[PDB]
């Protein structure tokens, strides 16, 4: 559970993140 | 109503041809219904505004003719049967029509239920569905079979039932006007009259004697609409190629003796008949329109607040949003 949690810092790689095509 | 509705119909199909589906309005089709020699070519070929109807001696409609106007720049017409024929020439079109009817029935009292397939193109009309049909009789004439009555009358009945469907209700004077075929088809479907004008025709040519007075006082069974009465090319109009404006100048003579239409005089003609039935085509299309934009807000949506990198979606669905919301302002 931590662990999963620090993937969330990012801000820039916000929409870096997002995509679901 | 009309008169805006008609270039946002094409419009409506262009952005749907982008989207790559199959979503068509469906616009409602109008069928012309009468005795045998009712004048039902004529009623039909005025609200078109051309001469392009088969009209003859004894029996007139000898085979349906199922009509889809299509929108296009040049004016022509081509038949099913006949793969790839040019004309050019309006008054020969006419002419072409009518040959194929006398192909199969000939000119001594005809019938056929083979339809006679017709596409006409021009850049001025809503793709619409008309039907000309054989007209229904009570006795034979010529050599007609004596069951001729439900021949005829089963082929016509399969247009008229289909929903929204204006009822030219042309009504024949050598028929008792209370056995109307006209007035029975017209208040099955659409018994109140918001589309249905009760029209009787040939009025100068009924026995002696019989009148359907009450009815046609809009007292008996009374319509919003009332009736319209309407005089029509005779025998002798047809068999010269009597034009279309001539038909119009027998009316009047007729209206003012009989007692069952005087006191509607200013309510009469075929050029009122017209201004009604327009109005009610209108709604139809309108209807199907919300539907399908809600479809399309819901796809968009996903894909963008997960950016899938599908942006293709959004271009595409955003362009039919746009022509559907101008349709539903009017």
């Known amino acids: ?21 | 109503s009309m008169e805006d509705l008609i270039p946002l119909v094409n419009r409506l199909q262009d952005a749907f041809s982008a989207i790559g589906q199959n979503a068509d309005l469906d616009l409602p089709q109008i069928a012309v219904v009468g005795g045998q020699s009712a004048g039902k070519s004529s009623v039909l070929e005025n609200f078109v505004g051309r001469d392009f109807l088969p009209r003859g001696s004894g029996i007139v409609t000898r085979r349906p003719l199922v009509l889809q106007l299509v929108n296009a720049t040049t004016e022509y017409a081509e038949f099913l049967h006949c793969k790839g024929k040019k004309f050019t020439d309006f008054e020969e079109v006419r002419l072409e029509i009518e040959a194929e009817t006398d192909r199969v029935t000939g000119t001594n009292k005809g019938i056929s239920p083979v339809p006679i397939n017709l596409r006409v193109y021009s850049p001025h009309v809503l793709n619409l569905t008309l039907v000309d049909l054989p007209g229904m009789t009570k006795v034979p004439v010529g050599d007609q079979p004596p069951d001729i009555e439900f021949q005829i009358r089963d082929m016509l009945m399969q247009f008229v039932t289909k929903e929204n469907c204006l009822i030219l209700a042309v009504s024949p004077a050598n028929s008792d006007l209370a056995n109307s075929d006209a007035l029975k088809v017209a208040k099955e479907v659409d018994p109140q009259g918001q589309r249905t004008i009760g029209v009787i025709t040939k009025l100068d040519l009924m026995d002696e004697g019989t009148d359907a007075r009450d009815v046609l006082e809009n007292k008996l069974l009374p319509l919003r609409r009332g009736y319209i009465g309407v005089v029509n090319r005779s025998q002798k109009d047809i068999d010269g190629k009597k034009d279309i404006t001539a038909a119009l100048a027998a009316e009047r003579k007729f209206f003012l003796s009989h007692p069952s239409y005087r006191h509607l005089a200013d309510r009469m003609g075929t050029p009122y008949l017209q201004k009604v039935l327009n109005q009610q085509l209108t709604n139809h299309i309108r209807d199907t329109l919300p539907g399908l934009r809600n479809k399309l807000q819901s796809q968009l949506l996903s894909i963008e607040k997960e950016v899938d990198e599908m942006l293709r979606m959004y271009h595409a669905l955003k362009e039919a949003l746009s022509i559907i919301g101008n349709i539903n302002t009017t």
């Open chain 1, 1 to 21: 559970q931590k662990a999963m949690l620090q993937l969330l810092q990012d801000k820039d790689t916000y929409s870096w993140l997002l995509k679901e095509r």
